[PDB]
């Protein structure tokens, strides 16, 4: 997160760290949606142009974290992965269209003050909350500049109009993406960055006070650049696939 601030304790209890077994390193953010399932960007697991093709065993998920590097004894839970599922039509060849992946954990993680799942939107919540101007929240332990943070970072950003998103890049934007960020000189800035990927873009419903994951941190041409914006996987547009995988293997 670029230009964000220190997350508060328990502020984002669905924040999941995607962590490589060896060398020990942070890979990406992810988010907790049930006691067995974790959501993340597909490119965190599979990205052939960089020889990235992780197997269940190469990885662990760390849930309930605040500190980036500390083993947070009695606070975090570390889980092994039972199975990885990548969206069958994830377009890594071109533009990361459908940048989404589910991870089934070997055992259920126990909830606590620091570990609690986020809601996924239904058709109504999507329509009602995904509008230009509305702000969502992004969290992660990725780069602070285009070093690394001691603690989970947070930033709130407004959703941007589809044409402005399209006009900011040469990349072909699909209906399974949306962008967020401030425009130049609005007087405010902020963005996700390398390491934040797979993390959640969330919004708090003013109808029921629940947090809903509207986006997954996906890509950007740099971090916090003027006239540029972060792109997020449109979670509701890919809900039939999410429900499908969960109903089939859970």
């Amino acid at each position: 997160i670029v230009e964000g601030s220190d997350a508060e304790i328990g502020m984002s209890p669905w924040q999941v760290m995607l962590f490589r077994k060896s060398p020990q390193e942070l890979l990406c953010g992810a988010s907790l949606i049930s006691d067995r399932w974790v959501l993340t960007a597909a490119h965190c697991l599979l990205y052939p142009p960089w020889d990235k093709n992780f197997t269940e065993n190469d990885l662990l998920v760390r849930i309930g974290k605040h500190s980036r590097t500390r083993y947070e004894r009695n606070i975090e839970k570390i889980s092994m992965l039972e199975k990885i599922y990548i969206h069958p039509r994830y377009n890594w060849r071109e533009n990361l269209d459908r940048d989404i992946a589910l991870m089934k954990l070997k055992k259920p993680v126990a909830f606590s003050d620091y570990i609690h799942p986020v809601c996924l939107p239904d058709r109504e919540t999507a329509a009602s909350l995904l509008q230009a101007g509305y702000k969502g929240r992004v969290t992660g332990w990725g780069n602070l500049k285009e070093g690394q943070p001691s603690v989970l970072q947070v930033v709130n950003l407004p959703i941007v109009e589809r044409p402005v998103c399209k006009d900011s890049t040469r990349i072909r934007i699909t209906d399974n993406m949306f962008c967020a960020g401030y425009k130049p000189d609005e007087g405010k800035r902020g963005d996700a960055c390398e390491g934040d990927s797979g993390g959640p873009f969330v919004m708090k419903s003013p109808f029921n006070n629940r947090w809903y994951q509207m986006g997954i941190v996906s890509w950007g041409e740099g971090c916090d650049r003027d006239g540029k914006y972060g792109f997020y996987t449109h979670v509701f547009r890919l809900k039939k696939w999410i429900q499908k995988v969960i109903d089939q293997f859970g």
């Binding site: 508060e8 304790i9 328990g10 502020m11 209890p13 949606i33 909830f111 606590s112 003050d113 620091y114 609690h116 799942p117 986020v118 809601c119 996924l120 909350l129 509008q131 101007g133 509305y134 702000k135 969502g136 929240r137 947070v154 709130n156 407004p158 919004m203 708090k204 419903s205 003013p206 006070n209 629940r210 947090w211 809903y212």
Partner: peptide
Amino acid sequence: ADCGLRPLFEKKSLEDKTERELLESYID
């Protein structure tokens, strides 16, 4: 079912430092 409700916030009715900013942006 109890998704999106934070034990240290919504469950004990406390508010984080910036959630008001989000709510303030939901104008319509």
